[PDB]
Amino acid sequence: VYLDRKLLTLEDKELGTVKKGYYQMKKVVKTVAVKILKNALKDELLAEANVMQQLDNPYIVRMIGICEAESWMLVMEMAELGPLNKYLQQNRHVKDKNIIELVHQVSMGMKYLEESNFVHRDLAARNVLLVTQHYAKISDFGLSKALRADENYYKAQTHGKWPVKWYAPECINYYKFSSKSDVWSFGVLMWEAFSYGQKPYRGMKGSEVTAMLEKGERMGCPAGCPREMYDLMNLCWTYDVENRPGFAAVELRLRNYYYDVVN
Ligand SMILES: CS(=O)(=O)c1ccc(Nc2nc(N[C@H]3CCCC[C@@H]3N)nc3cc[nH]c(=O)c23)cc1
* Nearby residues of 85 by Cβ (< 8 Å), 6 or more positions away: 124, 125, 126, 192, 193, 197
Q: 10 Å Cβ neighbour count for 6? A: 9
Distance, CA 217 to ligand 1 centroid (Å)? Answer: 33
Cβ–ligand 1 distance for 103 under 6 Å, the answer no
Extended beta strands in the chain, E state: 8-10, 18-24, 29-36, 63-69, 71-77, 82-83, 118-119, 128-132, 135-138, 145-146, 154-155, 176-177
Q: 10 Å Cβ neighbour count for 91? A: 14
Atom of ligand 1 nearest to the CA of 61: 24
Which method was used? X-ray
As a whole number of angstroms, the distance between CA 187 and CA 249 comes to 13
As a whole number of angstroms, the distance between CA 102 and CA 129 comes to 10
Q: Where in the chain is the domain with CATH 1.10.510.10?
A: 79-263
CA atoms within 13 A on the CB side of 260: 11
Q: Where in the chain is the domain with CATH 3.30.200.20?
A: 1-78
- Residue 149 to residues 118, 153, 154, Cα–Cα distance (Å): 11, 10, 11
Mutational test site, ligand 1, from 11, 14, 15, 189, max ligand atoms within 8 Å of CB: 15
Q: Is the distance from CB of 164 to CB of 206 less than 8 angstroms?
A: yes
Q: Is 122 a catalytic residue?
A: yes
Q: What is the stated resolution of the deposited model, in angstroms? A: 1.8
Distance, CA 139 to ligand 1 centroid (Å)? Answer: 9
First to last CA, the chain: 44
3-state helix, strand, coil split of the chain in percent (to 5) is 40, 20, 40
Buried b (16+ CB within 10 A) or exposed e, 155-168: ebeeeeebbbbbbb
Torsions phi, psi for 34 (to 5 deg): -125, 120
- Residue 110 to residues 58, 138, 237, 253, Cα–Cα distance (Å): 11, 8, 16, 14
As a whole number of angstroms, the distance between CA 103 and CA 189 comes to 8
DSSP state of 72: E
Cβ–ligand 1 distance for 82 under 6 Å, the answer yes
Q: Which residues pair with 155 in a beta bridge?
A: 176
CATH entry 1.10.510.10 includes domain 79-263: yes
As a whole number of angstroms, the distance between CA 148 and CA 216 comes to 32
DSSP states of 190-235: HHHHHTTTPPTTTT--HHHHHHHHHTT----PPTT--HHHHHHHHH
- Residue 196 to residues 57, 82, 119, 244, 258, Cα–Cα distance (Å): 26, 14, 26, 25, 19
* Nearby residues of 123 by Cβ (< 8 Å), 6 or more positions away: 110, 138, 166, 182, 185, 186, 189
Closest CA to 246 of 46, 131, 107: 107
Distance, CA 241 to ligand 1 centroid (Å)? Answer: 31
As a whole number of angstroms, the distance between CA 119 and CA 219 comes to 24
The residue nearest atom 25 of ligand 1, judged by CA position, is 78
As a whole number of angstroms, the distance between CA 202 and CA 68 comes to 41
Q: 10 Å Cβ neighbour count for 197? A: 19
Closest CA to 231 of 239, 223, 220, 240: 220
Positive or negative, the Cα torsion across 207, 208, 213, 216? positive
Residue 64 corresponds to which amino acid? I
The residue nearest atom 3 of ligand 1, judged by CA position, is 82
Q: Which residues pair with 137 in a beta bridge?
A: 129
As a whole number of angstroms, the distance between CA 73 and CA 187 comes to 32
Cβ–ligand 1 distance for 137 under 6 Å, the answer no
CATH superfamily of this structure's domain 1-78: Phosphorylase Kinase; domain 1 (3.30.200.20)
- Burial class (CB within 10 angstroms; exposed 0-12, middle 13-18, buried 19+) of 202: exposed
Positive or negative, the Cα torsion across 178, 183, 189, 191? negative
C-alpha angle with apex 38: 32 to 42, nearest 5 degrees?
85
